[PDB]
Amino acid sequence: NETDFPLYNNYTEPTIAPALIAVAPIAQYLATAIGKWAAKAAFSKVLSLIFPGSQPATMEKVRTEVETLINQKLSQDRVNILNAEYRGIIEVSDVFDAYIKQPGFTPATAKGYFLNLSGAIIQRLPQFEVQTYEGVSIALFTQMCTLHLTLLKDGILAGSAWGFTQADVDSFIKLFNQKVLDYRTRLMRMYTEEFGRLCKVSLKDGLTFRNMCNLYVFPFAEAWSLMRYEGLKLQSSLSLWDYVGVSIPVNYNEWGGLVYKLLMGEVNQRLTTVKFNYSFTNEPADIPARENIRGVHPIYDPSSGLTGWIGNGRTNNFNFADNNGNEIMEVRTQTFYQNPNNEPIAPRDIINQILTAPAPADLFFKNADINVKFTQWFQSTLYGWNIKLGTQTVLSSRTGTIPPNYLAYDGYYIRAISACPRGVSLAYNHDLTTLTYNRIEYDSPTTENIIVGFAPDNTKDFYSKKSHYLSETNDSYVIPALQFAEVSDRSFLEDTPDQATDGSIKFARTFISNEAKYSIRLNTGFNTATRYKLIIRVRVPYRLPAGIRVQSQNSGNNRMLGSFTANANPEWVDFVTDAFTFNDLGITTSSTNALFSISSDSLNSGEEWYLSQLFLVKESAFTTQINPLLK
Amino acid sequence: KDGLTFRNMCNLYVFPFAEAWSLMRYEGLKLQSSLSLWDYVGVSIPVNYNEWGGLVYKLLMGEVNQRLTTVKFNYSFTNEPADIPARENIRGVHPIYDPSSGLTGWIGNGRTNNFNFADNNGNEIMEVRTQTFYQNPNNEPIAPRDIINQILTAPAPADLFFKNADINVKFTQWFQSTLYGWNIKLGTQTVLSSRTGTIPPNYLAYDGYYIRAISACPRGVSLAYNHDLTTLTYNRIEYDSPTTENIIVGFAPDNTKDFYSKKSHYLSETNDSYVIPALQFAEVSDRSFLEDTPDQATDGSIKFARTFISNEAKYSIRLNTGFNTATRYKLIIRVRVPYRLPAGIRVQSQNSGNNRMLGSFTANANPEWVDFVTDAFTFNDLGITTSSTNALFSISSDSLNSGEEWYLSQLFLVKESAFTTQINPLLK
Amino acid sequence: GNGRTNNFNFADNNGNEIMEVRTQTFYQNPNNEPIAPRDIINQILTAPAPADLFFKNADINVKFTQWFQSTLYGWNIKLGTQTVLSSRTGTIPPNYLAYDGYYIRAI
């Protein structure tokens, strides 16, 4: 607090690398099972990873890590309560785990053991859903639902071997199909509640809480929605956000209407330049020196002019900033005083300049060092800033040395650099800030904050090459909907972090059509005779008479891959196309314009639908194991 | 002003016939001009020819496939030195087309002050007025001076379009200085009555034409920048300047009123031939520009120049009741391909889920305009009915190389029975 | 104090003193129209000595108004029978300045 020690992503000691958190081996094995499930054997492994040695020791490691990230701490009484519920789950699972490992056991015996385990988990689940402590317990809730949903799938697959009749399995399928939805709803209920509450205090606080869920909660929620299949890929592409600066409250309606859009900029483009509006002054000789951050201007595609200033880029107000075809970079004013005795010849300084930092030769910044120092004076608080991006010192404070604030995450790079408007209403231009065809910007006298988004390394190829490259050696590919080649107008950015991506497209055009296109190229050695299938993840809350249509476009060769009836349903649904090969689509190793198109007709006023992600999977590696239509 | 006056003449006496020349080899197409007439009111501003096609024409057209819904004016009045007479200034012009696109910005400037802001509290500042008072016992100069800076708003009428206007400017010399006084009227709405004295009328109107665009030309600044950045879409069509001191009005012919009202092309049974200017598109791809091709007897052509994804323009087509869907039709495409396109140019029908290829044409290099004719088809084949609301015609090509480009001019839809090629163009 | 009514240029120049500078500004929105036009006023107020050579009494008072950390002001000025300033912020109670057997010499 009152020390000048180095910080690490705003914290006082280094943070655990995202790949070394206590839930990481549980996620790693989950991804393996999504691609190939080992019947009547996966609940055991998941049991040994969540409760190693029949001990709750790992689950307490998870609690302590979460408590440190969000600066919330459970009381010693609440801790005694959770551990008691862990041991109850352990005992019942020890009985069941032990019995299936006995070769030649009695199937009807395990049936009763199976049922006892399921009810014991269902019974203790509400203990992790108390609203007063949901900021911490949401991570614990996720592991418990994960253990239960795994038990149901194993039971469904190994039916009679565990003493289940065909009416038993049919009962479990209905139970699974309902609880995979109910568990998602209950988790999202806790996340939106605590996030909305924390943002109203401060956006920095709400981002810090969101950074935790991205690592501990949302990757598993996505996994839940893939467990009914075998052969798809589990991959998260959620970004981590570092907020440096003052406190700015934000309602939840303001987060989704304006703020998130300003942070993302051009969601399918890499950053090539960012600029900063900087102020320095010490004109009253008594008051100490001060600095101000007035605006932030990230530039993505240099040919789009989509993103504008957040804050303001006005360096003066005496006349202009363009005129003669040249931008004004720095205005400096000096003033001099003098008296015979005790000469106050200390010349004051006023500085207003735009600071430019081009993207490096490596296309992306790997890390940064940005910090702000507060200084109190009567009723006023002053500011001093330090900026560094990559190896480029942008700003060294003129008010005094400021300790470092190392912003970095192993396995992540910097994609977006934005800021949040300060001192103005965040209620305007929501319905006008679309993905394209509008000026993504907001005016403000200052921002006094800088926000940095770290994207996972699995996204580096797309933001470098502007296309998705398919290999022969992989079986499944995930395509986040925001990694599009082009999109139609009157479409928005929707925050859907439960999908384990950085967002979804909400279409809302009432003329022509709604369309999103994705660029596909083939690496050499690709087998064009292999059969593939395509899965489309959408949500259709209003009826679409003409439906949704997936199509291949390869120069002159256009082909329909699937046309799907779109009935109204407020949950996420999956559409699977027939099989095809790449030779049918005419796509080769030299093809440079091949696109996948997902499209619908125009909509009515007040209607909308959502695109989340695409799944490309070899026909041999894919199966539907739990029919979703059996509710 | 002088160059527009000369261009207005050619539009009426020269260019309609040049287009006719390029249809004489056929029998069955339609001769129709859609060139606009431009009224320039204000001071003298020189402009090179490279500046006309790189920036100025684009600023005049705004959103080339949209109708105007609002235009705003930045107005200045002052008589602060009591000796010098009153003066007025036009500082900026902001035409708004699609209210959801934010494509067009100020030409000139919309800054009414510089003491602080113009937004902040979610409300735009409309008028700043400053008064000042003096006094002396004998010969009291109690005449209070006035300084006025305000934004003037004129919404598009209930008839969707203004039919005429009355705008004029009065010059007054004073030592080495020339002063200005302005009068503005649009339709039946008096926007500005001059505070310097009565100004005679200047009736702007052409029988058979209506007002589509209201723009202006930047004054006192270089017109050399942002040419390669001012595309049809995906960029901010604007230019900063201390004043404009001019207003430019474009009158479009009445044969264009249906498209700018309905946003679609309606086909009738009783007609034989239809012309579709390329700028009357439903949507267009990025990195495409406005090209002045007045010899085509239209208001311009699309120059495609995208080096990724694809180059595509789409056109909206609806059917009036009584249309015979069993009639056979053909489609003619007027393009210019100065560089080779290996994968060619492709015409396609898109009607909800029903997409069909109407023609795929070899694109060899040739610096003259060429015509591509598709095979015959019927509208029943394309699945299009009287209730269809999303049917589109797509003309597309692949991505291009750096420095390459091709041009789209117009489309011709003609009944197969009414059309013949009478002079083979391949016999050179 | 200071008699500067502005800082855009001058106060003399053409042989005449500048008495009042008033600035108005106008805003507008379709719904809940904030058409309340703001006002900025800077003026020099003159009060000549009466025909009786001296003012006998006066009525001058100031009203304080608190707002967050800020205190605002409103003034009322009267000399003799001449109302110099009536407050634009609201009514301010009188403050009778007078002493029997005394007159006003200095202000």
From Swiss-Prot, chain A:
GO terms for biological process: sporulation resulting in formation of a cellular spore; symbiont-mediated killing of host cell. The keyword Phosphoprotein does not apply. GO terms for molecular function: toxin activity. It comes from the Bacteria. Keywords: Sporulation, Toxin, Virulence. Signal peptide: none annotated. Coiled coil: none annotated. Belongs to the delta endotoxin family. This is Pesticidal crystal protein Cry11Aa.
From Swiss-Prot, chain B:
One of its GO terms (biological process) is symbiont-mediated killing of host cell. The chain holds residues 216 to 643 of 643 of the full protein. It comes from Bacillus thuringiensis subsp. israelensis. Transmembrane segments: none annotated. Toxic segment of the protein is located in the N-terminus. The gene is cry11Aa. One of its GO terms (molecular function) is toxin activity. This is Pesticidal crystal protein Cry11Aa. Promotes colloidosmotic lysis by binding to the midgut epithelial cells of mosquitos. Keywords: Sporulation, Toxin, Virulence. Belongs to the delta endotoxin family.
